Design a protein around this ligand. Structure first.
Ligand code: ENA
Ligand code: ENA
Lengths: 294, 294
């Protein structure tokens, strides 16, 4: 089992750490535009590994060949702002990075699944799937899983117990929504309060701590697990839709089944009201793609 | 089981994350001079927790009362340099911080064990034990464990397999040494190369990645585990010596037994040559304490 990470930044290295703690990993590859960082992260991670008596081959660098063999590759590479920048300006900057990476991944690990994390995630995962020859089963995004975790946290805070299934789907962004219909748990809540707490926790965390790190890391892990362990779990995933729920030519968050072969839309029955909301997010997402030439 | 962290910085939060991934923790408390950071780390950590269906009470802030109940408290709080500063200047600055913390911990979690991590670790753990009424079993330092992990990594790299026990003891610093005598593993190495690779890996990692983070985090975890799970493991620990191996009135790295009651010197038989080296580190450490008024 080889794991690839493009981007050894905060989220890249921490999510890899997480996988190291919780997966039977043989090799870990870290590729980043900043070489010494990739390398330095690879060293630290190995020192960590020895503390749970694990000794995988962990290599970090700036050359994409390191990725050969990766069963799957987490792509966190990208930019921040200059808080005088703009969502659009960044989308362009990062879109360039994702294009460039897509090529690289195809000509080094042409058979690997790809987990897109770079924000705006739903848009970047789409640009990744388009820019690489790949089928829609080998390219998908981490997002709603993270949103969901946050959801479950506010639910337990609101008295709910035995929470199997509470999901958020749609755009990993303002346009997100809870799938009330699929929610299952003991205790009564207040979807008003909860759904709203969730749209800007991300921002509240970024305000205080600097970035969202551990939340995202775990969500990435659960998605990697599901695949490298062929668990067949269903996890809200940013998927390329090509008919499903009435939605076409965009990536957006939907219940998906993960396993060795990647992701495939679970096709779970959604409320009528919820397919509306899903179509909302797709329109928003579609527009933001056009602004970019996709 | 409550865990306390004083310092929500890189090492503080990451080591707590690690504990969250691998321990049955009921509450986690994060105290830091920077409030919003402690708070922001507490939020992120909870979002993480929900992803492995854990829902402990995780609280972060700048008020030390948050620590009441902590079975044990990891202290990572402290400073960096201005790379035009000096080891001594920092030792003074941090010594102040440790003194101040010792008081705080005593008047909020007077019964908790204390894991000292702040560098220079052996010196800070001593100042912690002195400045708090506490017995030498409730105050100790993380260091050699980390050095050891690094050791095991260079050993496996050098062909060695089935490595039960490879330890580094003495000063967590230039003055450290391998306990060749206690080393057990299949395969032949080259203690020359290895022991030397180890003294400045730390520095090589800091050069490239910025700081040592994941290595330290795991080592802290293994020490917390050993205690909160009363495992009775033996781990190279910076212990206050009061007779052992011919050494007095200083903290320095030695095989220790960890468990519910804290740490106690394992009193393992060391080479004659190795008790020399141990006495070396103690002299060096003792001098550095005097420079500080201890
Ligand atoms: N989907 C989610 O829910 C979610 C949650 C949280 C965060 N995110 C997102 O993930 C992204 C990264 O999040 P992050 O905090 O880890 O960001 P970071 O710490 O700055 O590390 C970035 C690294 O990439 C590097 N780098 C820059 N350019 C390139 C590059 N690598 C390769 N190439 C090749 C060509 N160009 C490049 C650079 O050298 C640096 O080391 C951001 O968009 C976040 O919003 C998503
Ligand atoms: N022993 C080992 O092997 C080992 C390995 C690696 C590193 N270390 C050492 O651990 C220490 C921290 O390592 P680190 O990378 O995590 O450092 P950091 O990211 O800067 O986070 C520091 C936090 O403390 C904060 N803070 C500052 N002052 C106070 C405070 N908190 C409370 N009080 C009360 C009074 N004064 C203060 C501040 O607000 C910040 O959030 C350094 O000495 C490292 O060398 C040891």
């Amino acid at each position: 089992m080889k794991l690839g990470f493009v981007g050894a930044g905060r989220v890249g290295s921490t999510s890899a750490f997480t996988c190291l703690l919780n997966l039977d990993v043989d090799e870990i590859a870290l590729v980043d535009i900043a070489e010494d960082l990739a390398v330095g992260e690879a060293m630290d991670l190995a020192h960590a590994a020895a503390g749970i008596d694990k000794y995988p081959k962990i290599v970090g660098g700036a050359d994409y060949s390191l990725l050969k063999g990766s069963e799957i590759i987490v792509v966190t590479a990208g930019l921040a702002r200059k808080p005088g920048m703009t969502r659009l300006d960044l989308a362009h900057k990062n879109a360039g990075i994702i294009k460039d990476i897509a090529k690289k991944i195809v000509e080094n690990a042409p058979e690997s699944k790809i987990l897109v994390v770079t924000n705006p995630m739903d848009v970047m995962t789409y640009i990744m799937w388009k820019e690489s020859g790949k089928p829609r089963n080998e390219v998908f995004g981490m997002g709603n899983q993270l949103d969901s975790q946050r959801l479950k946290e506010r639910l337990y805070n609101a008295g709910a117990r035995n929470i199997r299934r509470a999901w958020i789907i749609g755009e990993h962004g303002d346009s997100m929504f809870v799938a009330k219909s699929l929610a299952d748990f003991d205790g009564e809540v207040d979807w008003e309060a909860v759904e709203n707490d969730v749209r800007f926790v991300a921002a509240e965390v970024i305000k205080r701590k600097g970035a969202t790190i551990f939340g995202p890391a775990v969500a990435i892990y659960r998605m990697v697990k599901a695949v490298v362990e062929d668990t067949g779990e269903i996890i809200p995933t940013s998927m390329i839709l090509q008919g499903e729920y009435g939605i076409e030519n965009v990536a957006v968050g939907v219940p998906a089944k993960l396993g060795k072969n990647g992701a495939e839309v679970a096709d779970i029955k959604l409320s009528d009201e919820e397919i509306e909301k899903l179509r909302n997010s797709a329109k928003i997402l579609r527009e933001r793609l056009e602004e970019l030439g996709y």
